[PDB]
Ligand binder design. Structure first.
Ligand SMILES: Nc1ncnc2c1ncn2[C@@H]1O[C@H](COP(=O)(O)OP(=O)(O)OP(=O)(O)O)[C@@H](O)[C@H]1O
Ligand SMILES: [Mg+2]
Length: 265
């Protein structure tokens, strides 16, 4: 697991966090709110090993053996592999890097549930390296009645970091604008996009209670609405989260808000 980098949990806004964000000056700077997707944590890794490299996939708790069946994600490996190679090439070219020890594209694996009679369940079957196959129609990432996104499996990117040396302490996290710029150039990559942008308080004013997930319509299902299909919530973050000048204040610059309807499930 030496190549694995755990992603994070995200807190609801506490009194001490909010006070510190104001006192530090960070609250007055630029923040975004993006959709919080209810799937399972996923990471796509590209690891440099000198003149060769390897693609690996992680769940919440670590990089997986290639024959671990995990919600049918093998159906997306060819896509992920093409995507992560493109992202690495973009980063190397733009940043003048001969080598990137470790590139980590974190996001949410989601979908494979959409209970509308005009939306057939997936007919797709994944295949593992050992030849075993599993139906996407049998995948149940989450049991909750909302949010529901799509009958197919998808990946929602929400962070990109790279370590030139490969060492954990040398990771550089893309800021929001750079994250969007690069992600927008990776073909067919779905990624977190700002629902609102402004001060911390402007983002905190986002109406999560009535926020219907926009993903079904983005994924072809605009004509097949599900009643009460609220998004889980939002993640709010400083647009330069990870930058040393932000991090020097020693205050976390990521928080979440959830809708009450979701919390009650
Ligand atoms: N836009 C997003 N930005 C960051 N994390 C997101 C986003 N959308 C979904 N997530 C997920 O939210 C998780 C953090 O939220 P939180 O601390 O509430 O954990 P959780 O969602 O309850 O955990 P679980 O993975 O078991 O559902 C992340 O680890 C990530 O998997
Ligand atoms: Mg979750």
């Amino acid at each position: 697991q030496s190549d694995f980098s755990p992603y994070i949990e995200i807190d609801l806004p506490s009194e001490s966090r909010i006070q510190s964000l104001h006192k530090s000056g960070l609250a007055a700077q630029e923040w975004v709110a993006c959709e919080k997707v209810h799937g399972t944590n996923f990471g796509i890794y590209l690891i440099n090993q000198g003149d060769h490299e390897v693609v690996r996939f992680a769940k919440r708790s670590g990089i997986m053996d290639p024959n671990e069946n995990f919600f049918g994600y093998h159906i997306l490996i060819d896509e992920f592999t093409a995507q992560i190679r493109i992202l690495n090439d973009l980063l190397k070219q733009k940043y003048g890097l001969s080598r990137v020890g470790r590139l980590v594209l974190n996001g949410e694996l989601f979908g494979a549930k959409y209970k509308h009679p005009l939306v057939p369940k997936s007919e797709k079957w994944c295949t593992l390296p050992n030849g075993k196959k599993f139906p996407i129609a049998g995948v149940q990432i989450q049991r909750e009645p909302f949010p529901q996104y799509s009958p197919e499996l998808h990946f929602f990117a929400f962070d990109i970091k790279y370590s030139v040396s490969g060492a954990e302490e040398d990771f550089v996290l893309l800021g929001y604008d750079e994250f969007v710029e690069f992600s927008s150039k990776v073909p067919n990559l779905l990624y977190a996009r700002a629902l609102v942008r402004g001060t911390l308080d402007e983002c905190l004013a986002f109406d999560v209670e009535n926020f219907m997930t926009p993903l079904p319509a983005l994924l072809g299902l605009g004509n097949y609405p599900l009643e009460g299909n609220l998004a889980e919530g939002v993640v709010i973050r400083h647009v330069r989260r990870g930058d040393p000048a932000v991090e020097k204040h020693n205050v976390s610059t990521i928080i979440k808000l959830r809708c009450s309807s979701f919390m009650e499930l």
